[PDB]
Chain A
Amino acid sequence: GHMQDLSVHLWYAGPMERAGAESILANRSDGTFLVRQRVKDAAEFAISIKYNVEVKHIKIMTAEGLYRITEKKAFRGLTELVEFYQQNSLKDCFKSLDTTLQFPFKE
């Protein structure tokens, strides 16, 4: 509500699935990323990035209210968490990664 609103972004898919999330990202160019809202427990939202003709999906955690993709590096919320990994080389937060939140999916 004019705060941490996520639907105002283009990388936020919220009620989206894995195959669905990558549907756009896979179709989109490399670096394309998005975030969905759903899980089961050890997480809240899920981040999906198109890197290497593939879409890497991860279940964000809500540590003390902070959102984190790797759980090692978190932020205030999603925007702050997704609008930072775009600079923070995933290779440091993720694993065999070598990029960052390049582009959204609604773009």
Chain B
Amino acid sequence: DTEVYESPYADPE
């Protein structure tokens, strides 16, 4: 996971 764009920011929570 950590190797790819672990969806940092977008629609979290």
* Binary B-proximity of A53-66 (CB < 8 A = 1, otherwise 0): 00011110100000
> Is B5 within 8 A of A18, CB to CB?
yes
> Is A95 within 8 A of B8, CB to CB?
yes
**CB < 8 Å neighbour of A19 from B3, B5, B8, B11:** B3
Q: How near does chain B come to A42, taking the closest CB pair, in angstroms? A: 8
Please, which residue of chain B has its CB at the minimum distance from the CB of A48?
Answer: B5
Interface size on A, residues (CB 8 A): 19
Q: Please, how many angstroms separate the alpha-carbon atoms of A69 and B10 in the complex?
A: 7
Please, which residue of chain A has its CB at the minimum distance from the CB of B7?
Answer: A59
> Is B8 within 8 A of A18, CB to CB?
no
Q: Please, how many angstroms separate the alpha-carbon atoms of A58 and B10 in the complex?
A: 9
CB contacts (< 8 Å) of B11 on chain A: these are 71-72
Q: Please, how many angstroms separate the alpha-carbon atoms of A94 and B9 in the complex?
A: 5
Listed in ascending order, the chain B residues whose CB lies under 8 Å from chain A are 3-5, 7-11
5 contacts between A and B (CB under 8 A): A43-B5, A57-B4, A58-B8, A58-B9, A97-B9
